[PDB]
Design a protein around this ligand. Structure first.
Ligand SMILES: CCCCCCCCCCCCCCCCCC(=O)OC[C@H](COP(=O)([O-])OCC[N+](C)(C)C)OC(=O)CCCCCCCCCCCCCCCCC
Ligand SMILES: CCCCCCCCCCCCCCCCCC(=O)OC[C@H](COP(=O)(O)OCCN)OC(=O)CCCCCCCCCCCCCCCCC
Ligand SMILES: CCCCCCCCCCCCCCCCCC(=O)OC[C@H](COP(=O)(O)OCCN)OC(=O)CCCCCCCCCCCCCCCCC
Ligand SMILES: CCCCCCCCCCCCCCCCCC(=O)OC[C@H](COP(=O)(O)OCCN)OC(=O)CCCCCCCCCCCCCCCCC
Ligand SMILES: CCCCCCCCCCCCO[C@@H]1O[C@H](CO)[C@@H](O[C@H]2O[C@H](CO)[C@@H](O)[C@H](O)[C@H]2O)[C@H](O)[C@H]1O
Ligand SMILES: CCCCCCCCCCCCO[C@@H]1O[C@H](CO)[C@@H](O[C@H]2O[C@H](CO)[C@@H](O)[C@H](O)[C@H]2O)[C@H](O)[C@H]1O
Ligand SMILES: CCCCCCCCCCCCO[C@@H]1O[C@H](CO)[C@@H](O[C@H]2O[C@H](CO)[C@@H](O)[C@H](O)[C@H]2O)[C@H](O)[C@H]1O
Ligand SMILES: CCCCCCCCCCCCO[C@@H]1O[C@H](CO)[C@@H](O[C@H]2O[C@H](CO)[C@@H](O)[C@H](O)[C@H]2O)[C@H](O)[C@H]1O
Lengths: 81, 48, 494, 72, 64, 670, 100, 73, 38
């Protein structure tokens, strides 16, 4: 049984049992605004992460695909003989 | 406006952030006379 | 004319307009309120213009006007990086002070607005004047309009409360007057630039200290002496309480960077152990009795005593860190104490008409938005990281410890006991059961006015707590001229 | 099964609307607007901090020593 | 000397056993019988032990 | 990526908390859960990336506190120790969210609950990824706020309010000492970045390490609930069960231990702090094993079992084998969180009842719960070849491995802790599943036998098992509780393993014991905990079931009535703190308020001066009578005194005595 | 060395950081003396900041081997930590001290 | 000023607050009140001040290494 | 009772060549065992 509650109370987190009908549309919109903020934070990390050791050419290290310091090293290392 | 350094030291005393030139060598003496321990801080650098 | 006089004249122009509009019309009181609020917006606009043009590492007073017409008492207005943020706090606070108390005054509305517009002038002055006798003049001109702000718009015990602040603040300020008068007679002036050059003899400085400290212990206030604050900061109207705690309490915090640190250094150094003992005691005795207070507004007032002790111990550390932490904790208390008087004296007392904590319980169930802001404000009062209050306490306590390690360790008890009073009050009012049974009918949650002044004040506390360098960059160079000391290999260079 | 969302925001019942008291006008345009304009201008304000100055010299003193590398 | 109440610990502890006759005997009969007999009680205290033990013996003989 | 791990749990919390209206209960649950799920994969990747390649990651974003010599950055450093901490933190957060989709399904306020869960995860990330001690302190305080917000989630229960104040202020006590210790580092070294503190520690004054070490120890034990500041961990079980699973027994308690493992390249330079950590750890293992044996609540037992394992980890730190405690730490969060989730299922399956006395049978009704919970108890007791066997029993043998008195003592002491651990773990599995039914009959009525005629459609409630969101964690957590010890026992234990070679766990070559613990210990002490566990388990089952009369003779002996109530009452510690410490402070506050503020301060001040002066002036104005004859005499009297004064050349002091003596006579009436 | 920035000319002290032979009633000279002592103390403490930043990179670069490879940086940083504090000018303004 | 919402003002609790606000009018100098008024105001702060006097500049942790002493005096 | 009867150590402190004095912070640091007393 659901608790009785006053219906005049406004709460940013819904209050009691609050689910809107349009919640899937609101949820989807919030997903993109999150995914956009995370994308800005990822491009920040890629360009500001600092490593003093460099990954081996053959071992799994997916950071090699987005981090400038590493990618600039392997591009320079891809120049010899 | 200015006073002889010795004059101010009498009222306040050397120490409490007032470290007049030569405070460390004097402190060496003061600690040796009281504690009886020779001060010899570590180099903290393996070369020279 | 100088741009620092424009800060003074605007509230003066605003008082004139409030008194001369009814002559162009039985005009509404709503139009009285709009004029006073617009005219405090302009001061804030100007004050930010002054801050953009400030020079963060200049050792000369800035925005000065060359007078060259000497008299006996001449206003000299200069801004310095140690005084700029006190001015900015004043000009941000006074619009919220007006908006907070927008529907609660109900009578003598013109007189109420004219006092606050008068107060903003006098409190702006006290940070802007370049003399220590000029400083005293404005530091004590705020006294008559505050006697009337409490007796006209105050609560039940308003008459005794207005006598207490006036007479205590008058008495304590007259021991500061005797010491200022001695300094002027010896030096010939009280203009800052001529005093800071001059070095007083140790015995004279030991007797000027007894006189500037009697005043500031009366105006901090320390525990033995705070009986005026527990009356005045409570019986006063909401707008009175915001100015009294955020701004008036800081007149002596900024008055130690001018009156003690640069001109009486040997006294400050040799007597610090007496200050620290007093400060440690008021961190304990005030914390112990803030637990047992049954008046919500009085509980907030008592919290200010414990906070002020931490900044007083910081300004007496002879360290660059405790000095900046003292200014930051002065600013931090300004925003946070303001919000908790808005919660105590301006929302519960608006809805319940009582301040007794026995009638409140479980206000989260019907006012969720009040609870959210009340908890954030309560955590800043508890000195929690991410707020500007935490930074001010961390740096204040550090310098207290580096200077005299035992008193800093007793001052650090605050960390435990500030948290205990703040959470206990919050838990009793918002949480702590269900909506209380003394509430016969339901209570509405925050209005759009109440939301946006709490939101504004809370926002200042967080963003300044994340990036305090907004205020630290101005302080570093100017604060670096109130430290007293030398190091053996860095001093007396050739 | 979830209930519908509800509440009177600002105490405004679903029929009518929030009546403007007076403060809203200057507080939203003047008070806050002054802070946004202050924030926008604060970006272009030159940095006169003592540290930005002390860093540039202190780098040059360390650069003479092997402690910091000199580009030249 | 015994108390004015007839209670005593020694007789209290001696009676701490399954009573021969109980006015509530039928009402409480369920907790100790059927699904709740001792065999079914610990029938599944070790769930996979039976399946694993025979399976492991298959592994052992596989090597030889 | 690394700075995205930090940000995702924060972002989901904002949507759920200040935007729960817009997304709804389901919208919040998906965003909160999925955002934390995403962070978990990013951190699984970061483990292979940082640890398995020995590539520490640095990032610095901006200044936090910039005063001269004090520059604290909003900066993060990913190293070998960091990525070890994240894996339990993020998986247990990820699974507890999924668990909570069904546990809190009937609660009115889900958007607030799931928000606090995301907020809690953000703060542990901040705690373990900071560059400096001060940003570490943001998460340290942050998780403290998040704990208070979740032990008090049902803020209408006064019990919950009391336990949240207790969680808050007991943790704020260790905050004071941790801040005092942080002021020692700034005073001694000018900065509090980790790299600075550890690069400089070997040369620092030995007595200064003993100040920093004893402050970082006192603060650590407040969060890790060691023998002294531990009163709050039991009380945290007021908040919902999934909070107890993540925060109060798998992640927040860990921050106390992580502070010592992080500060290892510093506190190894004091034997005092290590010989203090050692005993503080051993006292708590027995202090909390005895208490849990005597509790009637499932969660109070499992909370006191958390405390015993925490005491083992600090034992390992004082033993100076840091990598061992980092192993027990990661391992414990798997089989501990499994118990709470498992015991969370049994509480939900009945009536939200929590008492052991009213649970029985329920092994048939809850088949999965018993197995998974016995998966956990076998590793909690460190049954051979469980995830606990590779961590818990290595501390015991490494304790004896350090051939000193203190090492042998804590072996004996912790061994007793082991035997009482096995004892209350039998108490849990026997009472709730293997016992005679003890609760009401509705817990047990099936539909096979027909007990109803006109209401057979409803009114059964035969303690059903939970749904998918309830069981999928338990089964996954149990799969960890089996294989995880063996699979990582080389990363952490090894013999000469170089996982922590970035100085994340610096052990001083004057302390190491691995070689001795590998070879010196005899087989008897190497194997002894297995014998005790296999001996007292069958004994305990026999006493609890076969011979169900001995224990009551003990309880109703007077000697046993007292020993029972000494432990059930938690060593009387709460009673003494609440009466002697807490209530002393309230009466001190009352004495200052009543006797001084409203008393002697006002009697010796404004109210005293008011009362005296008004009486004084009434008397003086009683002189003024408008009688010219009396006025003339007064003028002549005042004339004579002037002539006497300025002709006898009397001492000026003689005058003031008269003047002051006169004023007092006007104070006196009649 | 690094070229001296344009912003590093308006704030560069023109005077030796002392008070010897400085008339106090000449305010501009006295204020510039004060400013010259403040900036030397600040450059000294920012020199430590930069060495500490190098030490940090050396620490994370060498890992276990930090105890042998970063000692020169350790020595410089530990010298600045006792030689440099920002102590102000107020003591030096009000006292004259000489080598003799 | 503004009319507030209806409160079941408790006759008991109102007079309890009216007791506290007026409490100081009845404080007397007894042997008990002097003892508390002497310990809190004199003894405890004098005791704190004495420790603050005797430990002033006694210890410095700044830059001190092994072989050096924390004590400055 | 543990103090009265607890074992003597069985392993001699491991000898390091040179004390690893260069790998622990020079002479101004605590160094491992090297041809000393027991
Ligand atoms: C960030 C996420 C914040 C989530 C806030 C959720 C919310 O609005 O709850 C309102 C809730 C109500 O949300 P609700 O929608 O569940 O409403 C329930 C129904 N009522 C309450 C009306 C009976 O109010 C409270 O519970 C009051 C306490 C607010 C606590 C604020 C949480 C964040 C505080 C800052 C922590 C930072 C730590 C730094 C160190
Ligand atoms: C819960 C936390 C939520 C935080 C939300 C806001 C995040 C803001 C992130 C800002 C990132 C800046 C990106 C550029 C890098 C720094 C460039 C620079 O010089 O900035 C100056 C100043 C301090 O940064 P810096 O001196 O570089 O610090 C050293 C480590 N980088 O850096 C600045 O300009 C900072 C000024 C903005 C203040 C940020 C916090 C306000 C709230
Ligand atoms: C602020 C909060 C402070 C908390 C307590 C901090 C204690 C710091 C003590 C620093 C002063 C030490 C003075 C001294 O030199 O005494 C010597 C002794 C250390 O000598 P030792 O460890 O045996 O071997 C030499 C180490 N190279 O040192 C001692 O024996 C002092 C006694 C032990 C101190 C550590 C244990 C403190 C326990 C406090 C419990 C309080 C209840
Ligand atoms: C350092 C030195 C001090 C520390 C070491 C000594 C500590 C005290 C040792 C003596 C007391 C030990 C326990 C004695 C028996 C006892 O009271 O056990 C109570 C406990 C709880 O039983 P309960 O759930 O209340 O009801 C019976 C359910 N079978 O009973 C059970 O859990 C039942 C199963 C165990 C019964 C036998 C326990 C033997 C312990 C030896
Ligand atoms: C050094 C002196 C002390 C410093 C502090 C100075 C405080 C000055 C207060 C403001 C001046 C007096 O303020 C004055 O209040 C009276 C109250 O009767 C107002 O007078 C009016 O009040 C109400 C307002 O609705 C009218 O209905 C009434 O008919 C009329 O008398 C004036 O419009 C206002 O200007
Ligand atoms: C260091 C010691 C402190 C330094 C100086 C401090 C002096 C402060 C003491 C002022 C005493 C209070 O001053 C006096 O208080 C009483 C109330 O109590 C006021 O009396 C007033 O309040 C009462 C309340 O019932 C009403 O009858 C009426 O409004 C009025 O008579 C007087 O108007 C005021 O003259
Ligand atoms: C932390 C310390 C704060 C100190 C604040 C400043 C103190 C001011 C000094 C004088 C204060 C007045 O001091 C006070 O004098 C009045 C008389 O005037 C006395 O008042 C009373 O005295 C006796 C009781 O002792 C009564 O019987 C008498 O009826 C009454 O006059 C108080 O007992 C005394 O304490
Ligand atoms: C966070 C703030 C920290 C700073 C404030 C507290 C600092 C405490 C520093 C204590 C150590 C100071 O320096 C310390 O002086 C004490 C004085 O008894 C000495 O202590 C020793 O004294 C005698 C010899 O006189 C010894 O026989 C005795 O075993 C021991 O007590 C230490 O050998 C010395 O190292």
């Amino acid at each position: 049984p659901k608790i009785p509650y006053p219906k005049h109370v406004w709460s940013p987190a819904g209050g009691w049992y609050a689910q809107p009908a349009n919640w899937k549309q609101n949820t989807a919109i919030f997903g993109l605004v999150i995914f956009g903020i995370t994308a800005m934070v990822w491009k920040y990390s890629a360009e500001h992460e600092v490593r003093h050791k460099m990954p081996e050419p053959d071992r799994f290290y997916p950071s090699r695909y987005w981090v400038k310091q590493i990618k600039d090293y392997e591009r320079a290392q891809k120049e010899k003989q | 406006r200015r006073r002889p350094i010795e004059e101010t030291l009498a009222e306040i005393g050397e120490g409490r952030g007032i470290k007049p030139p030569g405070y460390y060598e004097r402190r060496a003496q003061r600690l040796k006379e009281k504690y009886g321990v020779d001060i010899n801080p570590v180099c903290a650098d393996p070369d020279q | 004319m100088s741009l620092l006089y424009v800060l003074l004249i605007i509230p003066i122009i605003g008082i004139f307009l409030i008194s001369t509009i009814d002559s162009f019309y039985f005009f509404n009181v709503s139009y009285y309120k709009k004029i006073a609020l617009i005219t405090t917006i302009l001061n804030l606009i100007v004050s930010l213009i002054i801050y953009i043009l400030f020079d963060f590492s200049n050792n000369q007073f800035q925005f000065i006007q060359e007078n060259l017409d000497l008299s006996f008492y001449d206003i000299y207005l200069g801004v310095d990086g140690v005084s700029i943020y006190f001015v900015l706090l004043t000009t941000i606070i006074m619009p919220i002070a007006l908006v907070s108390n927008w529907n609660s005054i109900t009578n003598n509305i013109k007189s109420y607005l004219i006092i606050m517009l008068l107060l903003e002038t006098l409190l702006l002055a006290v940070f802007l004047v370049l003399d220590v006798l000029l400083f005293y003049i404005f530091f004590e001109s705020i006294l008559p309009p505050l006697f009337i702000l409490i007796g006209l718009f105050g609560s039940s015990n308003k008459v005794r409360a207005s006598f207490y602040i006036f007479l205590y603040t008058l008495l304590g300020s007259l021991f500061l007057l005797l010491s200022i008068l001695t300094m002027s007679s010896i030096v010939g002036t009280t203009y800052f630039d001529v005093l800071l050059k001059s070095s007083f003899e140790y015995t004279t400085q030991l007797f000027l200290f007894f006189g500037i400290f009697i005043a500031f212990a009366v105006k901090t206030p320390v525990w033995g002496l705070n009986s005026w604050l527990l009356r005045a900061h409570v019986e006063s109207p909401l707008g009175g309480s915001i100015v009294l705690a955020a701004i008036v309490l800081k007149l002596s915090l900024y008055g130690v960077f001018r009156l003690i640190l640069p001109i009486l250094p040997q006294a400050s150094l040799n007597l610090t152990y007496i200050v620290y003992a007093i400060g440690a005691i008021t961190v304990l005795y005030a914390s112990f009795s803030t637990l047992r207070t049954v008046d919500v507004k009085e509980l907030i007032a008592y919290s200010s005593v414990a906070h002020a002790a931490i900044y007083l111990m910081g300004v007496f550390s002879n360290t660059i860190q405790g000095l900046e932490g003292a200014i930051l904790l002065g600013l931090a208390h300004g925003f946070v104490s303001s919000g908790l008087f808005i919660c105590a004296g301006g929302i519960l007392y608006d809805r319940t008409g009582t301040r007794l904590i026995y009638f409140f319980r479980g206000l989260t169930q019907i006012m969720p938005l009040f609870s959210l802001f009340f908890f954030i404000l309560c955590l800043g009062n508890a000195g929690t990281p991410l707020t500007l209050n935490f930074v001010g306490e961390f740096m204040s306590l550090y310098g207290t410890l580096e200077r005299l390690p035992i008193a800093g360790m007793l001052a650090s008890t605050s960390i435990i006991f500030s948290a205990a009073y703040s959470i206990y009050m919050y838990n009793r009012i918002a949480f702590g059961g269900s909506v209380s049974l003394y509430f016969i009918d339901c209570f509405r949650d925050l209005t759009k006015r109440e939301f946006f002044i709490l939101f504004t004040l809370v926002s200042f506390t967080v963003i300044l707590g994340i990036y305090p360098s907004f205020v630290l960059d101005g302080l570093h160079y100017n604060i670096s001229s109130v430290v007293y000391g030398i190091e053996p290999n860095a001093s007396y260079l050739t | 099964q979830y209930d519908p969302p509800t509440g009177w925001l600002w105490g405004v019942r679903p029929g009518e609307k929030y009546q403007n008291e007076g403060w809203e006008g200057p507080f939203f345009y003047g008070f806050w607007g002054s802070l946004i304009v202050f924030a926008i201008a604060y970006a272009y304000k030159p940095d006169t901090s003592i540290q930005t100055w002390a860093l540039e010299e202190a780098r040059r003193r360390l650069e003479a020593e092997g402690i910091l590398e000199d580009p030249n | 000397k015994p108390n004015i109440t007839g209670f005593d610990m020694r007789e209290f502890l001696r009676h701490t056993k399954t009573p021969t006759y109980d006015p509530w005997e039928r009402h409480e009969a369920w907790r100790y019988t059927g699904r709740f007999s001792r065999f079914n009680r610990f029938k599944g205290a070790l769930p996979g032990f039976g399946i694993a033990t025979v399976a492991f013996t298959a592994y052992c003989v596989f090597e030889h | 990526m690394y700075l995205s791990i930090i940000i995702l749990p924060l972002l989901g919390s904002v949507v759920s908390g200040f935007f729960g209206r817009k997304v709804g209960v389901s919208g919040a649950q998906l965003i909160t859960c999925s955002s934390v799920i995403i962070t978990t994969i990013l951190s699984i990747i970061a483990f292979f990336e940082v640890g398995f390649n020995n590539i520490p990651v640095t990032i610095n974003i901006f200044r936090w506190i910039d005063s001269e010599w004090f520059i604290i950055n909003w900066g993060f450093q990913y190293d070998s120790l960091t990525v070890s901490m994240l894996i339990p933190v993020l998986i247990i957060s990820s699974l507890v969210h999924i668990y909570s989709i069904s546990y809190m399904s009937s609660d009115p306020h889900n958007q607030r609950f799931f928000s606090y869960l995301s907020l809690f995860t953000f703060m542990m990330i901040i705690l373990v990824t900071a560059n400096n001690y001060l940003l570490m302190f943001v998460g340290w305080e942050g998780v403290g706020v998040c704990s208070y917000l979740l032990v008090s989630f049902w803020f209408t229960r006064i019990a919950a309010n009391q336990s949240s104040i207790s969680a808050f202020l007991t943790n704020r006590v260790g905050d004071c000492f941790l801040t005092v210790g942080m002021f020692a580092i700034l005073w001694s070294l000018g900065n509090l970045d980790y790299a600075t503190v550890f690069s400089l520690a070997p040369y620092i004054n030995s007595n200064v390490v003993i100040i920093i070490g004893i402050c970082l120890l006192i603060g650590a034990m407040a969060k890790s609930s060691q023998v002294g500041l531990h009163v709050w961990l039991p009380m945290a079980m007021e908040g919902p069960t999934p909070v107890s699973a993540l925060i109060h027994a798998a992640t927040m308690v860990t921050a106390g231990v992580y502070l010592l493992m992080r500060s290892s390249p510093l506190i190894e330079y004091s034997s005092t702090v290590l010989l203090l950590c050692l005993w503080l750890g051993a006292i708590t293992t027995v202090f909390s094993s005895l208490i849990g044996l005597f509790q009637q609540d499932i969660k109070k037992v499992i909370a006191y079992s958390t405390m015993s394992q925490l005491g083992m980890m600090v034992l390992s730190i004082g033993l100076s084998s840091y990598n061992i405690a980092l192993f027990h730490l990661v391992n414990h969060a798997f089989y501990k969180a499994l118990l709470f989730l498992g015991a969370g299922s049994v509480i939900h399956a009945v009536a939200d009842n929590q008492d052991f006395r009213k649970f029985g049978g329920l092994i048939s009704y809850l088949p999965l719960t018993y197995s998974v919970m016995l998966i956990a108890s076998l590793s909690l007791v460190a049954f051979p070849f469980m995830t606990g066997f590779y961590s818990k029993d290595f501390i015991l043998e490494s304790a004896y491995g350090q051939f000193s008195f203190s090492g042998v003592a804590v072996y004996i002491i912790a061994t007793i802790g082991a035997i009482f651990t096995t004892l209350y773990s039998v108490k849990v599995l026997y009472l709730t599943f293997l016992s005679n039914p003890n609760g009401p009959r509705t817990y047990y009525r099936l539909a096979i036998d027909n007990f109803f005629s006109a209401q057979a459609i409803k009114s059964y409630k035969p303690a059903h098992e939970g749904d998918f969101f309830l069981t999928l964690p338990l089964v996954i957590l149990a799969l960890f509780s089996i294989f995880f010890g063996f699979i990582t026992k080389d990363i952490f234990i090894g013999l000469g393993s170089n996982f922590f070679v970035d100085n994340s766990l610096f052990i001083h070559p004057i302390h190491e014991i691995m070689i001795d613990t590998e070879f010196a210990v005899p087989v008897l002490f190497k194997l002894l905990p297995f014998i005790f566990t296999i001996s007292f388990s069958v004994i305990a089952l026999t006493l609890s079931e076969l011979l169900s009369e001995l224990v009551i003779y003990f309880k109703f002996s007077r000697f046993g009535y007292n020993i029972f109530g000494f432990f059930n009452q938690r060593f009387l510690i709460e009673f003494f703190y609440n009466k002697y410490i807490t209530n002393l402070i309230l009466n001190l506050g009352g004495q200052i308020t009543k006797i001084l503020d409203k008393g002697s301060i006002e009697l010796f001040g404004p109210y005293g001066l008011e009362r005296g002066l008004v009486k004084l002036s009434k008397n003086i104005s009683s002189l003024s009578t408008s009688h010219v004859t009396t006025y003339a005499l007064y003028i002549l009297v005042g004339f004579i005194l002037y002539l006497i004064y300025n002709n006898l050349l009397l001492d000026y002091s003689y005058l003031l005595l008269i003047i002051i003596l006169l004023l007092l006579l006007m104070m006196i009436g009649e | 060395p690094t070229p001296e920035s344009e912003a590093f000319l308006a704030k560069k002290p023109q005077v030796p950081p002392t008070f010897d032979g400085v008339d106090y009633e000449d305010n501009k000279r006295l204020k510039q003396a004060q400013d010259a002592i403040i900036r030397e103390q600040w450059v000294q403490v920012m020199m430590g900041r930069l060495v500490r930043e190098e030490l940090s990179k050396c620490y994370y670069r060498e890992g276990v081997n930090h105890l042998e490879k970063c000692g020169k940086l350790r020595e410089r940083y530990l010298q600045l930590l006792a030689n440099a504090k920002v102590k102000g000018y107020l003591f030096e303004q009000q006292n004259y001290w000489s080598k003799e | 000023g503004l009319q507030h919402y209806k409160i079941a003002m408790d006759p008991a609790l109102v007079r309890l607050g009216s007791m506290i606000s007026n409490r100081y009018k009845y404080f007397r100098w007894t042997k008990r009140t002097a003892l508390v008024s002497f310990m809190y105001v004199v003894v405890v702060p004098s005791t704190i001040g004495y420790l603050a006097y005797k430990t002033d500049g006694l210890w410095d942790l700044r830059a001190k290494r092994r072989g050096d002493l924390i004590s400055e005096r | 009772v543990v103090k009265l009867t607890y074992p003597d150590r069985v392993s001699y402190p491991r000898e390091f060549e040179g004390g690893l004095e260069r790998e622990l912070g020079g002479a101004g640091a605590v160094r491992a065992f090297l041809c000393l007393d027991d």
